[PDB]
Design a protein around this nucleic acid. Structure first.
Lengths: 54, 46, 114, 118
RNA sequence: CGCAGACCACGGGAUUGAUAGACCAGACCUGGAAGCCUAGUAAUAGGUGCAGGGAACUGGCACUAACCGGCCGAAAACUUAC
RNA sequence: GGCACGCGAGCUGGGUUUAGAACGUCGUGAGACAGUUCGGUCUCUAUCCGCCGCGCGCGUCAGAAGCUUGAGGAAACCUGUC
RNA sequence: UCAACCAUAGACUCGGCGAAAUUGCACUACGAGUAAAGAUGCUCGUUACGCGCGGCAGGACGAAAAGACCCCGGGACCUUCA
RNA sequence: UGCAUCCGGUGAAGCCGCCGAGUGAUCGAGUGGUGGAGGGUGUGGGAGUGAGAAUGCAGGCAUGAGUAGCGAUUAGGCAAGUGAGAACCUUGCCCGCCGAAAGACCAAGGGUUCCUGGGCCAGGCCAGUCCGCCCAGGGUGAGUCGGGACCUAAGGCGAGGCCG
RNA sequence: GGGGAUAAGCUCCGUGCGUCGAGAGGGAAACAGCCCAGAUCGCCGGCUAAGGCCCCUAAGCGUGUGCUAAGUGGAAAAGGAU
RNA sequence: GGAGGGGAGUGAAAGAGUACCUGAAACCGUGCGCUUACAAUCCGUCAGAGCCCUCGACGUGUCGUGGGGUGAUGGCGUGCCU
């Protein structure tokens, strides 16, 4: 089908504000004497030397 | 399944039909040149 | 009125909305933390923003001699730049208009002691 | 092993089975492989069962392995080294390790290893 | 991870552990494996032998993974009656 | 019996009502018949209200976890033979 | 009758590129009624926490096409002892 | 624009304004910011002389929407590689598809698309170190091949000519 | 007054009759033509019309004498009934 | 990585950077103040609480021949043109 009206500013921006993003929950790692912040999902793989840390 | 469009190109045909010689072969087809030759054209006839 | 440093990025190939989707995370986050968030973000607009933020921090360090850990991402905004048109074709002899968008991106980092 | 609960892994049971066999081949050939996650989740059990056949070594176990993987170098590898090497470890030969996602489609990725601790 | 489920939600567990997968055993489905031996001209049949194989059901086993962790989240007072 | 003789952005398309064709009757003729006869494209990604379900947020004068009362609403309500 | 189960392409979730027709407005309920005689917008009452997601398709006399049936005006083409 | 006078790089117009005015169309020779060269006043003259609507024209930008789709019924994968950056680019081993075709050779047609080197802000329905994309350079060799210089059909043009 | 069924928000005529058209404001629950009244602009002044004075809604659950028992008031006929 | 940018410079001015005189509106966003999650809104108008900014007369903060932005709540109120 097809809309019928020019859906307003309020409604538009309101719903548009649901299309957002969340940030992964970060955690320290003692990468060879120094520290970097990495998700928890990848913690073991970092401590074992696979994660490409730039 | 017949999607045969109108323009199956050829060139000998193009020139024996829409060509210079066959424009100049008559009277009406010269005047077709006299407008194009005056209007400002570049490719009077293929 | 704390000492600031500025950084821009112009004629970038990411639509501004898909930039703002990320920037909402880091308005107010510290520099280091934002850089990391953006390293580990699943969005394809995180890398330009990363480059801009580290650029501003670097300009603050070199050109205005500031400590890199007293910093925050104070003000950020992405805006719409030019727009290029492409007549992409479609059925029944119709032709619709893609608009390839771009975006400018602007960062201003203060230097805030606690 | 426990079948896929939903739709399959590359577009059919055929392609699924072929894919699992190629990946077990590569695994036993190298020791690590990096692949998207549900493939690993689907490839722990398959591979552990092939390994168990290797442990309980025999003509019959060997043929019932060769009727999947199609690579004699890799079956020789199993029955020569990987079989006895995992004698006493009763169960649990593989390991999964998640890693950085993939650029093209954000898809998960995981490195599946064989353990080496006994 | 689930017999909960469009995603999210819901339910359980999270080394002070049997949640899942594997492994051992069992139940059930199929129906008498391969190899060797024998009889046969050969097709093939018989023995070893409820054999072997195998997915969800069940009991056990900590062998692999459940991590050496991040984030949210708590008190203006005021009057009568007491 | 009603609700666009309920309901085609839900389905059909036999009829009726496009172009083809034929019979009867009228018309000199083109052609016509609330006469007949065989055939004949049914387009749309649901913006809003509405409705069935499901979430996020905030609230109920501190923050939280369990057990629940019941205003008010819904579902069910059929019948027979020896 | 009388429908049930399975697999693939979609549909749903995630990452990327990214249009469309349509559009007077807008923080757009229901009823009985009134009215250019079928009311989201008026009256009088009843109900409803803000914002979203999947899905259905009753209405918005929904979108499309300055009606193709009818009538008027102008043309066109066809006919005939005009 | 005719005529007379006034302001103007010691900052006109135009634009954003604030403060104010007129019964109204409107006004500020009242002042700030921006900005950089012409304007105002009174009287007369002349008008392409005032737009909110023409299913109006041209350009730009929104809602729908960060939604539908991303072009078949063959199916992709692992290691290594250079690279800033790899689901797709190069190689290795697998795997799978067509196999009177989805294979090899010509005609029409198109016109450098071919090779090498370099390149990736545009394009490819994503990205791309890749490409029929971009740039430069290079490259097509005929006594016997398909045509002409050899011949003619359909048909064409048509000296003279006949008709008009 | 005609036509009509002495039906139509029907149709057709008359009318120094009206209003709407071109006419706001008040009352009529909302309501172009009904009743009142014909808007030069302002005032945080007063008196009145139509209509109305229990609350919603500003003004009287006003005074006096009688009826109503039907929620008449706040639709209705032929006819029936101490 | 490069695009692009920040300093240093040129220049009278880089609010003249080869996307370049001026540089409007629609449109797109960032900050600051008020307001908004028990409510039925042609989106306004009349009254107006409360808070925030400002000018002025004064006095330790304070009303005013004030002015401006928002504006809870109440009444009234049926888009523009043809």
């Amino acid at each position: 089908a097809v809309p019928k009206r020019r859906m307003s500013r309020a409604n538009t921006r309101s719903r548009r504000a649901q299309w957002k993003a969340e940030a992964p929950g970060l955690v320290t790692v003692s990468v060879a004497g120094q520290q970097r912040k990495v998700p928890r999902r990848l913690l073991k793989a970092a401590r074992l030397g696979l994660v490409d840390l730039d | 399944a017949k999607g045969k469009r109108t323009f199956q190109p050829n060139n000998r045909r193009r020139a024996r039909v829409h060509g210079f010689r066959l424009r100049m072969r008559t009277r009406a087809g010269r005047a077709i040149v006299a407008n194009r030759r005056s209007k400002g054209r570049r490719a009077l006839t293929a | 009125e704390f000492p600031s440093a500025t950084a821009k990025a112009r004629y970038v190939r990411v639509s501004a909305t898909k930039a703002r989707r990320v920037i909402d995370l880091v308005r107010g986050k510290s520099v280091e933390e934002a850089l990391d968030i953006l390293r580990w973000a699943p969005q394809a607009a995180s890398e330009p923003v990363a480059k801009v933020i580290a650029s501003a921090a670097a300009n603050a360090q070199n050109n205005e001699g500031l400590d890199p850990s007293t910093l925050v991402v104070a003000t950020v905004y992405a805006d719409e730049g030019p727009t290029a048109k492409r007549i992409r074709p479609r059925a029944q002899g119709r032709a619709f208009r893609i608009r390839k968008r771009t975006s400018h991106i602007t960062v201003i980092v203060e230097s805030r002691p606690p | 092993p426990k079948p896929t609960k939903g739709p399959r892994l590359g577009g059919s049971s055929s392609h699924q089975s072929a894919l699992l066999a190629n990946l077990a081949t590569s695994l036993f050939e190298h020791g690590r492989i990096k692949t998207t996650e549900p493939k690993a989740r689907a490839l722990r059990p398959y591979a552990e069962k092939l390994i168990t056949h290797a442990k309980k070594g025999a003509l019959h176990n060997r043929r019932e392995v060769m009727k999947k993987i199609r690579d004699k170098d890799v079956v020789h590898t199993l029955f020569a080294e990987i079989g006895p090497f995992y004698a006493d470890r009763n169960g649990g030969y593989t390991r999964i390790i998640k890693v950085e996602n993939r650029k093209g489609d954000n898809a998960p990725m995981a490195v599946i290893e064989l353990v080496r601790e006994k």
